[PDB]
């Protein structure tokens, strides 16, 4: 088997490789790179997503979000409260003002040491889930403005016509904004470009070790698990590596940089920050190999996920006895 200790894998594809996505996936998993649960894509050094970020000011972040916690430095939630509307511009120089800009630090592992003492302390505002697209349109190679949707891979696979789209989002973050410990949407994959400015923390667990993290989730954040037996789903949750290695949890960490791309593979778990001002553009994706992922994906019924109008079809084709409670939980 490849990859047995579920490490964390870093793929270098030339300029012919980078042709055909679903191609390159299917290269990366017959090296194990799935069982990590995340991988890193650095392109060809002839790639480019478009030609300079010079003209990204105007964008609007129509709800950017203050993250505010609540627990122990390495056992925590938080909630979302919505800030009034600002440019990317006007995001930019917040995010590089004294009281939001990173602090001085030696590297990353000083930097992680920093946000985990510290995060809790902060409110950080994040302009996350901005539906669009920073891909230049002439960018032919790993565009994710320009990928299949699921909702063909499920016809191609199962034969099943639905509604339904899917298109990339855009993240404007800066230090210390954090993503939550959770796998995507049905278990699906998802792809992740750093477009421009500080790096991206990522943590993540082997889709093989899941359920260990769900079971320690249960036993931290004890009053949630009783509301909802998908918990995790609600995406607000924070578990430190310190915490992690306490418990035994297996995992892996590392450090996206400006110009590389991750991929999450169905049913991996992860968490992470940004370290300063920065932007990605990520989607879900999905392959035949997810198809049973989704099939077994836990649902949050309780109504505190919402998710997008696209899930319906996935959740009513591919787990009918699920769907009724479902549905009941987006209304
Ligand atoms: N349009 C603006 C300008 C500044 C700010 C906001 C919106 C909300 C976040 C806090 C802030 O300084
Ligand atoms: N796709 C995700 C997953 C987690 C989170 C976000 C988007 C933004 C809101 C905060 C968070 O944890
Ligand atoms: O970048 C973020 O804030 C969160 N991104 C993801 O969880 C992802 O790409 O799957
Ligand atoms: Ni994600
Ligand atoms: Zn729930």
């Known amino acids: 088997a490849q990859n047995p200790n579920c490490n964390i894998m870093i793929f270098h594809p030339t300029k012919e490789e980078f042709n055909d996505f679903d191609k390159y ?20 050094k002839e790639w480019k997503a478009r030609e300079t970020y010079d003209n990204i000011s105007e964008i609007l972040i129509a709800t950017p979000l203050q993250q505010v916690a609540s627990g122990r430095a390495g056992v925590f939630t938080q909630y979302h409260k919505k800030k009034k509307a600002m440019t990317v511009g006007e995001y930019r120089h917040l995010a590089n003002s004294k009281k939001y800009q990173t602090p001085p630090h030696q590297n990353f592992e000083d930097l992680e040491r920093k946000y985990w003492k510290n995060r809790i302390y902060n409110s950080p505002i994040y302009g996350a889930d901005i539906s669009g697209s920073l891909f230049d349109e002439n960018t032919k190679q790993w565009n ?18 639905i509604e339904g789209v899917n298109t990339p989002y855009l993240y404007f973050g800066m230090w210390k904004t954090t993503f939550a410990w959770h796998t995507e949407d049905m278990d699906l994959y998802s792809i992740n ?12 667990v082997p889709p093989e070790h899941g359920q260990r993290l769900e079971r320690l989730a249960r036993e931290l954040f004890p009053g949630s698990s009783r509301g909802c ?12 590596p310190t915490v992690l290695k306490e418990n035994g949890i297996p995992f892996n960490r590392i450090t996206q940089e400006a110009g590389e791309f991750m991929v999450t593979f169905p049913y991996g778990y992860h968490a992470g920050f940004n370290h300063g001002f ?42 009918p006895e699920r769907y009724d409670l479902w549905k009941r939980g987006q209304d």
């Open 229 to 240: 037996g998908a918990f995790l789903r609600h995406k607000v949750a924070l578990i430190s």
């Open 25 to 44: 996936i299917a290269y990366m998993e017959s090296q194990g790179a799935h069982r990590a649960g995340l991988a890193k894509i650095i392109p060809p």
């Open 193 to 204: 470009y750093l477009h421009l400015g500080e790096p991206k923390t990522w943590y993540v």
């Open 278 to 319: 920065n932007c990605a553009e990520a989607i879900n994706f999905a392959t035949p190999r997810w198809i049973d992922y989704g099939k077994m994906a836990s649902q949050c019924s309780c109504g505190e996920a919402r998710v997008t109008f696209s899930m319906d079809a996935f959740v009513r084709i591919l787990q």
């Open 144 to 161: 994710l403005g320009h990928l299949g949707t699921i909702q063909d891979l499920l016809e191609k696979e199962c034969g099943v016509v």
